[PDB]
Design a protein around this ligand. Sequence first.
Ligand SMILES: CCCCCCCCCCCCCCCCCC(=O)OC[C@H](COP(=O)([O-])OCC(O)COP(=O)([O-])OC[C@@H](COC(=O)CCCCCCCCCCCCCCCCC)OC(=O)CCCCCCCCCCCCCCCCC)OC(=O)CCCCCCCCCCCCCCCCC
Ligand SMILES: CCCCCCCCCCCCCCCCCC(=O)O[C@@H](COC(=O)CCCCCCCCCCCCCCC)COP(=O)(O)OCC[N+](C)(C)C
Ligand SMILES: CCCCCCCCCCCCCCCCCC(=O)O[C@@H](COC(=O)CCCCCCCCCCCCCCC)COP(=O)(O)OCC[N+](C)(C)C
Ligand SMILES: CCCCCCCCCCCCCCCCCC(=O)O[C@@H](COC(=O)CCCCCCCCCCCCCCC)COP(=O)(O)OCC[N+](C)(C)C
Ligand SMILES: CCCCCCCCCCCCCCCCCCCC(=O)O[C@H](COC(=O)CCCCCCCCCCCCCC)COP(=O)(O)OCCN
Lengths: 375, 121, 64, 51, 104, 293, 71, 71, 111, 60, 145, 99
Amino acid sequence: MWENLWYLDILINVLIITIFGLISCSSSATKSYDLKGCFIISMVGGVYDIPSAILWCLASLSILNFNGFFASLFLVFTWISNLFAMQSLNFLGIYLAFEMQSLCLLVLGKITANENQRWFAYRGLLKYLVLSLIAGSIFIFHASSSYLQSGVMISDSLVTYVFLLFKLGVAPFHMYTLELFSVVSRHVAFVFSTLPKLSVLYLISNSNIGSECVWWGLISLWLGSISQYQSVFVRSILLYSSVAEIGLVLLVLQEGFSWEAFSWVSIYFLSLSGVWHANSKFVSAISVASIAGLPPFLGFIGKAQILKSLVSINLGILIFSSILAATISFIGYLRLIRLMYLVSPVKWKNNKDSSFINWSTWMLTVGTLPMVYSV
Amino acid sequence: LYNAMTPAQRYFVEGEHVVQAEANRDILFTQLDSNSYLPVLHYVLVGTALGVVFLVLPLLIVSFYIVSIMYLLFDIEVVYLIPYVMTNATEYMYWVMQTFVAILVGGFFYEWRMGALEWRE
Amino acid sequence: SSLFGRTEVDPTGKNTNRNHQYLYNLKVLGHKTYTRRDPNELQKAQAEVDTLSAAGRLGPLSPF
Amino acid sequence: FNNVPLMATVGLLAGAHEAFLHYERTPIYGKRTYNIIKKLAPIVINKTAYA
Amino acid sequence: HNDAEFLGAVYNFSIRSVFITGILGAVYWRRNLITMLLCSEIAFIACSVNFLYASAYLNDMAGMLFSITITTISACETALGLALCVGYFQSRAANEVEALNLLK
Amino acid sequence: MNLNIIMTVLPLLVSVAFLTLSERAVMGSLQRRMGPAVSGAFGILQPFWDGFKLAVKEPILPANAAAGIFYAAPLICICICVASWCTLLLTDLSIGGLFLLLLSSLAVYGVLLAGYSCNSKYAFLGCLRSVSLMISYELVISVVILCVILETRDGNGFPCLNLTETASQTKIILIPAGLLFYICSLAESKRVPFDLPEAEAELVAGYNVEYSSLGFAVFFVAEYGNTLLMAALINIYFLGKLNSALIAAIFVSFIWVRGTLPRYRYDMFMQIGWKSLLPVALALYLAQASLGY
Amino acid sequence: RLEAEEVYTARSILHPILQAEWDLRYLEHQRKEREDEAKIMKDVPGWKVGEATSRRRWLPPVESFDVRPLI
Amino acid sequence: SGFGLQSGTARCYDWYMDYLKCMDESKAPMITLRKQECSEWLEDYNECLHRDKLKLRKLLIEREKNKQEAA
Amino acid sequence: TWPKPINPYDVPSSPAYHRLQEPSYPVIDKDPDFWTAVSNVRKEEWGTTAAVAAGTFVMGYYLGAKGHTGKASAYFTSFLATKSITLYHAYNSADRLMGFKENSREVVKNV
Amino acid sequence: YALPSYVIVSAAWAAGFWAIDTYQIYKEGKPSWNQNKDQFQRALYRRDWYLRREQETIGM
Amino acid sequence: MLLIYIMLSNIVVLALSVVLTSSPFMALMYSILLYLNVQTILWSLGYDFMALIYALVYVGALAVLFLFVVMMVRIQVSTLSTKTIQSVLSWLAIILIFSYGDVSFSFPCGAESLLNFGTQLYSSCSDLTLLNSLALTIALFGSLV
Amino acid sequence: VARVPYSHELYAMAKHIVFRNEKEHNAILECKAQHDWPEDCKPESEAIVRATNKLFQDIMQKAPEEFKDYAKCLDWYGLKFSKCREKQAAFEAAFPLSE
Ligand SMILES: CCCCCCCCCCCCCCCCCC(=O)OC[C@H](COP(=O)([O-])OCC(O)COP(=O)([O-])OC[C@@H](COC(=O)CCCCCCCCCCCCCCCCC)OC(=O)CCCCCCCCCCCCCCCCC)OC(=O)CCCCCCCCCCCCCCCCC
Ligand SMILES: CCCCCCCCCCCCCCCCCC(=O)O[C@@H](COC(=O)CCCCCCCCCCCCCCC)COP(=O)(O)OCC[N+](C)(C)C
Ligand SMILES: CCCCCCCCCCCCCCCCCC(=O)O[C@@H](COC(=O)CCCCCCCCCCCCCCC)COP(=O)(O)OCC[N+](C)(C)C
Ligand SMILES: CCCCCCCCCCCCCCCCCC(=O)O[C@@H](COC(=O)CCCCCCCCCCCCCCC)COP(=O)(O)OCC[N+](C)(C)C
Ligand SMILES: CCCCCCCCCCCCCCCCCCCC(=O)O[C@H](COC(=O)CCCCCCCCCCCCCC)COP(=O)(O)OCCN
């Protein structure tokens, strides 16, 4: 009964915070800092390893910028889904955790849209939903055929690999990210383009869910880079950058380089935080540079880990593609830098809510030298 | 009428008497058709025919959406509770059920607190 | 559990890597293993049953 | 003959792409005098053959 | 010669047809959003039936638990999607005609 | 088939007709009137006159409505009532009462389809109100049934919901849950306290009012049949073995409560079912669960 | 609880006898089947009657008398 | 899972557990190698699940019986 | 085959989560209760519990004051953190009693 | 008067209940046809049916 | 055997009817009949409670939700009939292609028991029951706002 | 062909079997637990089948009416022991168990 207590504590904690927030709901404290702190303390009870500690760090940072009890509760639900995804041992754990996370995305997207923004937000949420239903239905149908043929539910199968490919958003399963994340709030797009990835990478690495095929990462790298170069809108540039990078990361993760993907996801989170939560031109420039991979910033270390892993596998086509695609991506990032300081006078809203943004910019600048041992 | 098709299903009984007896049998609950839903479908057909006969005889001569969603989710919660009542529960099965009920009562409390249960809207 | 599980390190070092699924099935469900009876024992026992039946001590194979 | 299946598949994917783009634009609500398949089949066939 | 082999083949054909009709039916014959979600439900039901069939074939409870999971998740997904559809329809501008029919 | 179906359907038809006669006989007695005496002398034949006359009336061709759904609604109700009674009296289904619960959730379709036939903006709200009442008090009925299954075990000790086994023993512990089952049964039959219709239906807001022939006949007959089924369920679950006298007495009780209680507004009854009946039924469930086996 | 324990005891007593008579009936039927199979396969060369499908464990018949479709 | 429908365990749980035990005994440094060593146990589990060999045997017997009957 | 008889009252059941490990150390208690585990918690762990409780009271008050509900937040946060740390300490002590983890002090203190 | 209508309902349902009870007890052969049966009881009834048919075949 | 075959074959006609019909209200009615046919298929595999579950959750509750939405959003979709002979045969061809030559397995019959299902759901498999409850809570909270 | 008495009969003689036939019951249980194959357990199956049939025959002579009456009562009440207490007590008195 003692092993069960560890899991039970999380539920008890979430329920009591939920009912406390409901009972103590008032206009005087719309930003429930106390509940945010209780949720952060609660999520420390699920840290068991280093990946769980990274999941906690990212969830806490995401929770800081959500406003209101409701949004923070749905982030805790996302965290619970992510924690269970890492521990999934068969098809049922994978399906259950990922579909719960999809539900939390649908709610978070819906509750962060203004009345004037409902026409486009609800359309993008509906398109995301229908595509998610296609993915889940094909997954469960194939899983049923596999369970019937083999008699057992084994997470080492092509069915799970293709499903996790959809979840990562590589090859041709990246369009939901483009459609949904363009029409949603900047914070929601940022937290759901980084945090979910860690769980999928952990599942792939731990459950041996790798394929010999390199076509999907090669496709994601080239499509993402070319689409980033041809995209007029800045949201699309940022969205396609993640497609390209996660394609390369997928290629690296299939070959067993788990440590490098777990370090990359953390650096990418810190790099994306300042560009997405744009308030200052300088913070945004340092973020764009880190995503680009410029050497003085922590982004260089993250890209270096992936490139270093690529040279070990000794696949020439991947290295050539990587160099050319990286150059094409660099042109898009230069476009972003040009738009801020070299095109026209820029005036932005004074949204002075830089919770972890200053810390992230500092961590990007300063972190390169401490983490130099990795590369 | 489902019919056994293998010797093992027929309790390794040989002959063709058994096959004929099985095929021409009547639905009896204390024989080979126990817990059978075939009578229910015979009842559905009889009821439909009776209605069709009556129907044809003369011819010759936002709150609602909310209640629907809450109903569906509470109904699934009750569907989960149905297996528990169908077992002789132990102390640990009781506490799992209590956690489930606590989660349901929390969702109910949220509905009450937020004014969904009131039907003024 | 059946669907979820986490891994921790052993400080003592006695416990080692084995299939988690096998260990779980052994602990929760258990493995039933059966042998095959050697022919000589079976032949003697069957002959004994037949001998008793011929003597008439044993009852009928079918009641009616 | 062993290696052409790849080229044929790529040609079929390209032709299906272009045919879909043409089909999507055509309006369901308005009745069309012409047969859509007769318009679309050359696209796919020609692309596959050339590839 | 074997009824069960014939019945198994018939079941496999039927279930596969129902799955493809659900997944590709509403998109093929362009329909409203409400029909797309109904066909998605049909597909999920087909998969859950396949799991129940497998559980009966292998005398195992895993399919029955996956199937209850499908029932729960599918209903939650439908409820959320229908809420989104209503919200989308209430915000439609006068010019927009078939707002629900995206595939037009 | 079996000869039993005849022995079930025919008594249901006779009984429903006299249920209709009883409704007015009791209401007259309460209001110092007398049972109808111009139809005949004994008064036994009074319902047959109404049914036979309703047959004679000239059919009206359907207007601005789909023909299929219009025909379907009577067939659906006449099917549910038959299946219910024949699964209540002629089956051994281990979870038979759960099947009855499923058959009671399908009664919502007939009302909804009738509302759809009107295709009126007001009628859309009126049907939504009726279905809201049925689903809201069906949830409470489901929780009450859960309470019924904790106390119902068979001789072999296997938990189940066989109507014969629940009927075999009478448990006074369940009586607190029988009161809720009785209030919900009143709600599901749209009796006076929960009779939102009548006030809304004075004007043609929408309801089965549209039919005026064999279609209207089956609906009213089904209404009484469902009320009698609820009375049978109250007898079988909370009052022991099936007794014809008890079923009739419970129906009479329904009529009495109807007469003595005013109707409720839409918000009031729904607020009763969600914030009053449901917490009570959940407390009774948790209490029975905690008592143990 | 006491009636249930009585019924369980009785059933646990009857189960060995019912399984023993089922096993014996199975054995006579399988013998008859193998006799017919050998008769049919006399012409075919390189055919061994009574070959073991499973090397070690006994394979029970998938279909059983107890489980009959509800409909 | 591994649990049975009525009670006990699945119809072919023991065969799978046999194969898992064989893999546990093996000392091969990779899972692929161990599966190669324990392939015969997997063939037994697959055989119990689908009875493919018994179906083939029955098909051959039926076909030969038909040939004899026609002659 | 024949269906095995099932006793409804005694149907085999197990908890969801199982620790797959043989006890390295002696088993003081095979199945410790909550109170037994709580009674075996070390003094240092109780000190950690009290330090956490005080720190979370101060942090709760600080965060609550921005929303005009300092006292309520302080008490809730204290209770929540104390409860979680206490459950963690009890889980560790139960594992020590079961012999999974080092129990030198535990065996000596309660023979 | 409520009593005559009530009596007719009571008597009609009593007659129906008696008719179904007797009919079933005549065909099924026992008053316990409706009682709940578990897997073991269902298998026992099935075995009894097949054994009776075997006995009939053996006798003739 | 005929009844099982008829139900299995019918499920295809009831699925084709949903997509072909142009009325959203009528499509739900065909889906309801499909759900009932699925309940009857489940009865042939030996499941009673599971088949009850499908009808309760889908027919009893989900269909009501679909009708509520359809009434609120009512649109004029009787524009034109586009069911040309060419389109239907192409659809039936796509269906036949996808649903052909897959691995088939002998039809099984398996008696189910609630005692075992309840025991497993609330003991060995308690992790699933609570995550499902959390999913329902997530849906409740998100749908109501 | 191995056959044993009908359900009602087996229930009526169930208490007697464990007192009188202990040897065969234990043997069959042990062999069945040890060996899966039905041929391996054929002697013990034959033994317990013959023993049960012999018990049925000696009960049929010693207490013909009492057994028949109990078996009919059990069959009438759907194999429920509780409802037949009087007949069971009479049959047990007429034919004592454990010799
Ligand atoms: C103080 C001592 C700390 C020193 C060491 C820490 C270990 C002891 C933990 C002590 C706690 C200190 C926390 C520090 C580390 C956190 C780890 C941890 O805690 O668990 C690990 C530890 C055992 O796991 P393990 O040591 O990792 O080894 C397991 C295996 O080896 C398998 O695990 P593995 O993954 O480590 O395997 C080895 C791995 C090798 O892995 C490594 O080498 C790891 C490298 C370390 C990087 C550190 C950064 C990680 C970010 C997380 C930050 C920590 C957040 C703290 C969260 C917990 C807070 C307590 O090899 C791999 O290839 C796997 C890939 C690993 C990921 C790749 C690493 C890259 C990370 C990203 C870096 C990228 C840079 C980004 C920015 C950098 C800028 C400078 O677990 C525990 O001891 C128990 C957990 C208890 C935690 C909370 C419970 C206490 C409170 C209970 C109730 C709570 C409610 C009340 C609240 C009370 C307050 C209000
Ligand atoms: C070895 C470390 C390197 C590896 C990196 C990963 C490890 C992380 C180590 C350091 C983490 C530091 C994280 C920095 C977060 C920055 C602090 C912060 O975000 O404060 C917010 C907090 O905002 C909130 O929402 C407060 C809610 C909760 C407050 C804190 C919760 C505390 C819970 C307990 C945490 C203790 C951990 C528990 C046990 C580990 C205040 O900002 P705002 O007021 O919203 O806007 C600022 C406006 N302007 C700057 C422009 C003036
Ligand atoms: C130095 C050791 C002892 C310090 C005394 C504190 C002991 C009290 C017990 C703990 C209570 C909480 C500790 C206070 C820290 C934060 C409290 C706070 O938020 O300060 C102000 C407002 O927020 C701030 O000003 C920020 C202050 C940040 C902390 C500055 C204090 C630094 C030391 C205090 C805590 C040190 C350790 C506490 C004991 C370990 C609160 O505003 P009100 O809710 O309106 O209460 C004021 C009461 N009244 C107006 C009615 C007279
Ligand atoms: C993130 C997780 C999501 C999924 C989590 C799945 C894992 C959690 C599953 C468990 C849910 C809770 C079930 C109880 C958990 C631990 C078991 C337990 O403590 O019950 C005790 C029962 O032991 C007790 O101590 C009885 C008193 C329990 C009092 C309360 C403790 C459990 C509280 C559960 C919280 C639910 C209450 C309401 C929720 C707010 C152990 O059972 P037994 O040992 O079989 O019974 C005792 C018999 N004997 C000791 C003699 C062998
Ligand atoms: C208190 C003891 C302490 C122990 C705790 C136990 C708690 C009680 C549990 C016992 C279970 C039995 C409960 C009986 C059902 C009554 C439900 C609760 C009573 C109640 O809340 O009153 C009204 C509900 O009754 C209604 O008004 C429903 C409508 C009634 C119309 C039909 C009535 C039929 C006749 C009554 C049934 C008799 C059966 C046979 C004739 C709500 O109304 P409210 O608004 O005032 O409450 C809201 C005030 N915030």
